[PDB]
Design a protein around this ligand. Structure first.
Ligand SMILES: Nc1cccc(OCc2ccccc2)c1
Length: 171
């Protein structure tokens, strides 16, 4: 069976218990923690690309009020479709399965300023999603995988000082 497992799930859960936050900037900011997954059950002989996108979690935005995240208003129109292609793509099943797949270079932004960045709306919640795309396939068969442990709110600045401290502790 195809199995995609989240790496460092206990680390993600430490951030999720606080409500995770990722900084967005004009020029784009890398994530901490980094999304990394282990993969088994691909065809080692076949070629695949790995894609990452971010799914909006809510029909509303969020606000940090008195140390609590609470619903913060109606949402902005959805961010444009942004897909990140894992730079090892395309590659053999054997390549993807031999070591965890790390999305360490993806950049989150709040301005369409190019550079293969992901545009996100500030104070909106997102959930990372990985797609495995088989190459040379007439059926164009693509598997998707959500990681609920990795949900976060996009912010221009950290709201929760416990998140600021965690980011420094573990990074
Ligand atoms: N791509 C793939 C390869 C081998 C087994 C496989 O499991 C069948 C399946 C699992 C989960 C959702 C839908 C279908 C999927």
């Amino acid at each position: 069976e195809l199995r995609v497992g989240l790496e460092e799930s206990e680390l993600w859960l430490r951030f999720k218990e606080l409500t995770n936050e990722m900084i967005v900037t004009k020029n784009g900011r890398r994530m901490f923690p980094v999304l990394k997954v282990n993969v088994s059950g691909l065809d080692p002989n076949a070629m695949y690309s790995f894609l990452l996108d971010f799914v909006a979690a809510d029909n509303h935005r969020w606000k940090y009020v008195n140390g609590e995240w609470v619903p913060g208003g109606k949402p902005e129109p959805q961010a444009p479709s942004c897909v990140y292609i894992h730079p090892d793509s395309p590659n053999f099943g054997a390549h993807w399965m031999k070591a965890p797949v790390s999305f360490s270079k993806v950049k989150l932004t709040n301005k369409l300023n190019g550079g293969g960045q992901i545009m996100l709306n500030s104070l909106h919640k997102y959930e990372p999603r990985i797609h495995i795309v088989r190459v040379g396939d007439p059926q164009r068969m693509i598997t998707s995988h959500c990681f609920p442990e990795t949900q976060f709110i996009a912010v221009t600045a950290y709201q929760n000082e416990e998140i600021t401290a965690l980011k420094i502790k573990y990074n």
